[PDB]
């Protein structure tokens, strides 16, 4: 894709979509055929996201969110504490965290998405129709993707799902709802002689957008900030028509606007017919009982602490020539060495380092401004800080979480962590998890994406020299209420005893315990061993660095032919994998025996002898099992 670079952000004429806003291609797991490469992609130390998803919206969204530095030190600070309750929070601190670490090697966002579904489900005010109106957007099935203008409606439930959740952490912070929080007064004046006062804390400002009898977009932020309307609705408490008159006024000014532009497509046309529209910096005071915004300090000069407004980032709508839609991030990182900024935009996995001119051109007929954050000036210089500066609580891993504690059908009897064995840097462990599948593809055009599967187990066991080397310490089953499909019994193992209501064994919710598990693990510095890791970590949507893999997979690895750790086993010892399937604390073990194997014959210097043997062997044999 080279001849029209895929990352060419430019065209000649505007009427024309450049390559990097266009319809990217499908990706798919490791093929298979074939396996997808994003080198070509993203060439910045910033990981794009995986758009295999059903929410389809929340991806740019969650780029939008990822460069605020009070937003993502907060939501990846909390990750310190346990927090299992607030599923959205951690789930966006775990994903921001992988993001971060992940350093432009592409990552998934299934799991917060998997609890955004898993929350707007979890039913049977006028909270939830906002709440039930998110399932006729996600998992598709509506022609064309985006219809206006749900990616606002996104913003909104998404800043006040946090904030609710945020104040349900172990230390009920108020840092995002003082960060987002616009101080509303909404008055109802039912007559002149009385009046009625509603307060909301807002998250973020709805922008429309009519009449404000200079073109820029100042005034309008002014107009949502104090403006006066009517309203048609007629008061039952009469039965008559009633037509009401309501003052909404804004009283601070908040360290981050979050803005949602709900124009008509004539307005829009008009924002494209004007330049600059989109002001990259501005200032404002609150004067009166109103809140004043000038491009400048020398336009108002004020009275009390003027604050300064940039443009932190923005989220558009692109409308490519074939009249499909999509959703696009734009967004600024300071750079303190060289006091400058640099310009991402964000398509999915496709990511790339823009010109500030390019990043605020509105004069695209493709181009539509959806959702625009601007950052206090101060706040946006600040370092983005990451959880590895705070102390960490790693005592899920020395005690047991679950619901319920039946404890039915244990297994073989694994023994906790003791903090004389307490895992650091350097240490290792086996680890193997299965899962179940909960749907299966589309079709899409023949005269549209391969999903999904689900965590369903996941075990890890010591793998240090010791009395309990090799005794399982992790053991646990996941919790997942939705359907499935197909259970792969034969492939996974599973009983079924998955459900909480038949205990089955040691059901545990993954909402993050097993992950904060895995996640502790890896961020402390343990290098994970056992056969086929890669996917097991796609679908645990985990990213642990290669040097920490050891993956027999890999070494045992000829010909570009991934052989079952089973066929290994066979070949080089008793087979477990055929008597009896199927556990997961067998394969990680097993998976153990083989790291250490081919590090004896790695030792030895003879070990690409008996590869050569194994495979002429085997080619020969066709890789039969006997039994
Ligand atoms: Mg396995």
Redesign the pocket.
């Known amino acids: 894709p080279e001849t029209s670079d895929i990352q060419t952000y430019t065209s000649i004429n505007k009427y024309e979509v450049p390559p990097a806003y266009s319809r990217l291609p499908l990706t798919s797991g490791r093929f298979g055929t074939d396996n997808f490469d994003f080198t070509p992609f993203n060439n910045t130390e910033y990981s794009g996201l995986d758009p295999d998803v059903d929410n389809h919206y929340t991806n740019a969204i969650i780029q939008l969110y990822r460069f605020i530095p009070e937003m993502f030190n907060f939501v990846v600070g909390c990750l310190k504490d346990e927090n299992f309750e607030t599923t959205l929070l951690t789930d966006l601190g775990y994903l921001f965290d992988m993001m971060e670490r992940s350093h432009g090697k592409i990552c998934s966002s299934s799991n917060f998405q998997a609890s955004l579904k898993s929350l707007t489900d979890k039913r049977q005010e006028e909270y939830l129709e906002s709440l039930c109106i998110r399932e006729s957007i996600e998992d598709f099935n509506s022609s064309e993707s985006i219809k206006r203008n749900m990616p606002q409606k996104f913003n909104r439930f998404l800043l006040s799902q946090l904030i609710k959740e945020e104040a349900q952490t172990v230390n009920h912070n108020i840092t995002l709802n003082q960060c987002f929080g616009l101080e509303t007064e909404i008055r109802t004046e039912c007559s002149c002689d009385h009046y009625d006062t509603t307060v909301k804390l807002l998250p973020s400002l709805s922008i429309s957008g009519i009449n404000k009898t200079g073109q820029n977009i100042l005034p309008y932020i002014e107009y949502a900030m104090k403006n006066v309307t009517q309203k048609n609705s007629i008061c039952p408490t009469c039965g008559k028509t009633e037509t009401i008159t309501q003052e909404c006024t804004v009283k601070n000014l908040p360290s981050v606007l979050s803005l949602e532009l709900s124009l008509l497509d004539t307005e829009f046309s008009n924002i494209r017919s004007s330049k600059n529209w989109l002001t990259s910096e501005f200032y404002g005071s609150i004067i009166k009982n109103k809140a004043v915004l000038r491009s400048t300090a020398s336009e108002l000069k004020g009275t009390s602490h003027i604050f300064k407004y940039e443009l932190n980032g923005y989220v558009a709508k692109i409308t490519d020539n074939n009249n499909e839609t999509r959703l696009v991030t734009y967004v600024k990182k300071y750079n303190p060495k060289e006091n400058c900024f640099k310009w991402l935009m964000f398509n999915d996995y496709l990511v790339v380092e823009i010109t500030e001119e390019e990043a605020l051109k509105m004069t695209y007929p493709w181009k539509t401004p959806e959702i625009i954050i601007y950052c206090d000036a101060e706040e946006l210089r600040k370092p983005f800080f990451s959880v590895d500066t705070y102390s960490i609580n790693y005592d899920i891993l020395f005690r047991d979480y679950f619901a319920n504690g039946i404890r039915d059908t244990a297994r073989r009897e694994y023994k906790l962590l003791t903090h004389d064995e307490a895992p650091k840097s350097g240490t290792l462990v086996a680890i193997?998890?299965?899962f179940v599948s909960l749907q299966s593809e589309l079709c899409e055009i023949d005269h549209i994406r391969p999903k999904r599967t689900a965590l369903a187990r996941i075990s890890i066991i010591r793998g240090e020299e010791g009395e309990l080397y090799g005794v399982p310490f992790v053991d646990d089953y996941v919790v997942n209420t939705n359907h499935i499909e197909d259970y792969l019994t034969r492939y996974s193992g599973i009983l079924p005893g998955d459900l909480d209501p038949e205990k089955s064994t040691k059901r545990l919710v993954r909402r993050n315990v097993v992950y904060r598990k895995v996640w502790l693990l890896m961020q402390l510095g343990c290098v994970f061993v056992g056969?086929?890791l890669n996917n097991?970590f796609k679908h645990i949507n985990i990213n642990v660095p290669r040097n920490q893999i050891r993956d027999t997979a890999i070494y045992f690895l000829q010909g570009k032919r991934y052989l079952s750790l089973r066929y290994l086993a066979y070949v080089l010892l008793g087979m477990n994998i055929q008597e009896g399937n199927?556990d997961?604390i067998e394969?990680?073990h097993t998976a153990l025996i083989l790291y250490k194997k081919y590090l004896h014959l790695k030792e030895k210097a003879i070990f690409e002898k008996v590869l050569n043997s194994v495979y002429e062997e085997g080619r020969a044999h066709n890789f039969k099992v006997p039994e």
């Open positions: 193997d998890a299965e056969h086929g097991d199927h997961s394969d990680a």
